Amino acid sequence: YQPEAYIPATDTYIEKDSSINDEIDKLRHSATAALFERRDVIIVASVSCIYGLGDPEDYTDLMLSLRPGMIKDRDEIIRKLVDIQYERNEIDFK
DNA sequence: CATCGTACTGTTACGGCTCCATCGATGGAGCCGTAACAGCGATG
């Protein structure tokens, strides 16, 4: 990670560059889901636990509920899935 | 010295697409030259 910064002494600006690790992201998402799923969860974290995450109210209110017999268009459900940052990929299924 | 931050920019291999340069011969018919073949009369 190289956060953007500006140095007035040299009048030079550095652009932001980052790389994402898949395993750590999956572990973080699993921890976040387990927090809302079960109460008997133990989380081992670094000082990263004090950095800005999303709103828990938005996380709870944006859960999609589906049951048999409920009328709903397939396109509407696909749009709802896309709106919660789900990527459609028939080749790379992860 | 380790820790943290809401999917980052620039330059190279490699496969697929497209444009451009560069590169007589054989059989049939007619002709010439050469060889080959066919085709009144008088007397005893």
Q: What is the resolution of this structure in A?
A: 3.2
What is the experimental method? cryo-EM
Does the C-beta of A15 come within 7 A of strand B?
yes
Chain B: nucleotides under 7 Å from a protein CB? 3-10
DSSP string covering A33-69: HHHHH-SS------GGGGS----HHHHHHT-----TT
Closest CA to A94 of A31, A38, A25: A25
Does the C-beta of A93 come within 7 A of strand B?
no
Q: Which residue(s) pair with A14 in the sheet?
A: A5
Q: How many Å separate Cα A38 from the centre of its chain?
A: 19
Does the C-beta of A3 come within 7 A of strand B?
yes
Contact between A64 and A78 under an 8 Å Cβ cutoff? The reply is no
Contact between A27 and A41 under an 8 Å Cβ cutoff? The reply is no
Distance A70 CA to B44 C1' (A): 150
CA-to-CA distance for A85 and A34, rounded, in angstroms? Answer: 19
